């Protein structure tokens, strides 16, 4: 249950690099140094965390590679409207492994995800979309969602409207995105 | 110098599938059937052509995979403003192979591309950007550009504002996009 040190960040960045290269996704040396490692401020990176390569992000489009270690969870959040921006719409495409995405709707029986008991209160949507390599789903703006990688981890691509991560809203009050 | 038949389209679609899978890019069966094969209406697909998988294309963002056979050329074009749309801005990322992209600016000496004599009149920009796997370049709207794959072909990803291919403007008057 540790604060996010320089050394933990390095270890996670190197692991995400290994995963990307094993999936045959080429990345430049400059990109290797720029991969973002977030524990969402929750201090258990291998439980709640994401390792992110931003390919491009501007007002007109965004694309990222979201690397997830085995059973890593992205905590529940929504990309809200901000001023006259509608909020981010995103399409996820699983490239490698598998991911369990949860969105609003009828609760899926026998969900695949496993959430710590202490954190169950912070997952409110339970309609399951399982994505395997090549499969996609689109999330409209201001929609609560979260995801957990399967037992071998996942690489999930994002194609989206502009990303403004600083303005995301997280169900878990403990989360600090940056 | 042949019209684009059902059989030529099938052959090219299958070759693009082989290339995608060799590059470890997963694609679904439905996507395999939906890959677009265009000879730009010029009747020499292996000289001028593109094989395209659209991942997603809506008013807020677009992402595609552009598959190019060895030395296949995308003829020169620009994505213009249309009404109050600025025109498409796109970022290209080479995933596999290599591609020679040409944009406006100072002519690059010793360009890598090889253009048929009959078609040289239709390439007006000659500032070369070579992209190898992992490398990117961004093209602003209404900018003339064209590209040729290297000797082993290329897979180039596009991340872009919405795509409206029907409205592209091509230097070569012979081109019919669809
Ligand atoms: O903000 C947390 C993360 O949420 C995921 O769903 C994606 O939207 C990422 O782009 C983002 O960085
Ligand atoms: O229209 C021809 C093609 O031009 C390429 O540069 C890309 O912009 C493709 O998306 C497009 O289909
Ligand atoms: Mn999201
Ligand atoms: Mn273009």
Author numbering:
A (entry chain AAA), B (entry chain AAA): -1 to 176
From the paper:
The native TsLI protein was crystallized without bound ligands and in complex with either 40 mM D-mannose or 15 mM D-fructose. In the mannose complex the β-D-mannopyranose tautomer clearly fitted into the electron density. The two complex structures of TsLI with a bound β-D-mannopyranose or β-D-fructofuranose are very similar overall, and superimpose with an RMSD of 0.2 Å. It was possible to trap the slowly reacting sugar substrates, mannose and fructose in the TsLI active site due to their reduced turnover rates. In contrast to other characterised lyxose isomerases that have been reported to have a broader substrate specificity especially towards D-mannose, TsLI is highly specific for D-lyxose, with other aldoses (each used at 10 mM), including D-mannose, D-talose, D-xylose and L-ribose utilised at significantly lower rates (<2%). The high specificity of the TsLI reaction towards the D-lyxose/D-xylulose pair seems to be due to the steric hindrance caused by the side chain of R175 that occupies part of the active site cavity. This contributes to a highly restrictive substrate binding pocket that is likely to reduce the binding of other pentose sugars and to also affect the positioning of the linear form of hexoses such as D-mannose for catalysis. The reduced activity of the enzyme with D-mannose is suggested to be due to the steric hindrance of R175 that makes the active site cavity too restrictive to bind other pentose sugars and restricts the hexose ring opening that is necessary for turnover.
Here we present the biochemical and physical characterisation of a thermostable lyxose isomerase from a Thermofilum species (TsLI) which shows high thermal stability and is highly specific for the substrate lyxose having little activity for other sugars. D-lyxose isomerase (LI, EC 5.3.1.15), is an important aldose-ketose isomerase reported to catalyze the reversible isomerization reaction between D-xylulose and D-lyxose, as well as between D-fructose and D-mannose and several other D- and L-sugar substrates. The overall fold of TsLI is a cupin-type β -barrel, with two α helices at the N-terminus, followed by the cupin barrel made up of two antiparallel β-sheets. The conserved manganese binding site is located within this pocket and is co-ordinated by the side chains of residues H75, H77, H143, and E88.
